[PDB]
C-alpha cells in the first residue's frame, strides 16, 4: 500500500503504519492501520507463476 504512486526510478524505504481510514494511529498497529511491507511465499512445489 502507498499514498500516491511512484516517480520513474524512485525508491521508497519507509517503515510506517499506513492509515486506511480516518482514525490516526501514531505508531499503533490496529484495524485499518497495518504494515505496508508484506513478504513473499516462495516454496518449490508452487506452480509456474
Amino acid at each position: 500500500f502507498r499514498k500516491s504512486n511512484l516517480k520513474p526510478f524512485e525508491r521508497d524505504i519507509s517503515t510506517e503504519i499506513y492509515q486506511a481510514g480516518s482514525t490516526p494511529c501514531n505508531g499503533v498497529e490496529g484495524f485499518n492501520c497495518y504494515f505496508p511491507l508484506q513478504s513473499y511465499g516462495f516454496q518449490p512445489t508452487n506452480g509456474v507463476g
Binding site: 516517480k7 520513474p8 526510478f9 524512485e10 525508491r11 524505504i13 519507509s14 510506517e16
Partner: protein
C-alpha cells in the same frame, strides 16, 4: 523517517551521502557532522567572490550546474551575462521538497 541528501566541502573534498540522517535544528559545522543509518549512496571527488549554482531533480537524477567569477561590488548581483557549465549527475532516487544551507561557525553554538 525519510531519506535525505547531504553535500559537504572541507576545502579539500566533496562528501555526498544519501543515508537516512537525523538532523539538528541549527545544523552547522565548527571551525563536524557524521551519523548514518541505512545508507544507499556515497560519493567523493575533489566581497570579491561569486559562485552560482543550479539544482534540478528529475527522474532519479540530481543535476548541478556551476560557474564562478571575480566580482567587484559590495552587496549586489552584476549586470552582465555569464553561462553555467554542468557539474555532476548524481543518481540518488529520492523525493525532495525542502532544503537548507550549512555554515562554518567558529564556536559550537548548538541550540
Amino acid at each position: 523517517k525519510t531519506q535525505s541528501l547531504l553535500i559537504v566541502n572541507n576545502a579539500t573534498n566533496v562528501v555526498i551521502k544519501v543515508c537516512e540522517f537525523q538532523f539538528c535544528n541549527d545544523p552547522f559545522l565548527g571551525v563536524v557532522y557524521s551519523s548514518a543509518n541505512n545508507c544507499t549512496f556515497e560519493y567523493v571527488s575533489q566581497f570579491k567572490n561569486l559562485r552560482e549554482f543550479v539544482f534540478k531533480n528529475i527522474d532519479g537524477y540530481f543535476k548541478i550546474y556551476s560557474k564562478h567569477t571575480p566580482i567587484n561590488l559590495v552587496r549586489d548581483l552584476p549586470q552582465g551575462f555569464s553561462a553555467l557549465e554542468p557539474l555532476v549527475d548524481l543518481p540518488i532516487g529520492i523525493n525532495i521538497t525542502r532544503f537548507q544551507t550549512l555554515l562554518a561557525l567558529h564556536r559550537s553554538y548548538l541550540t
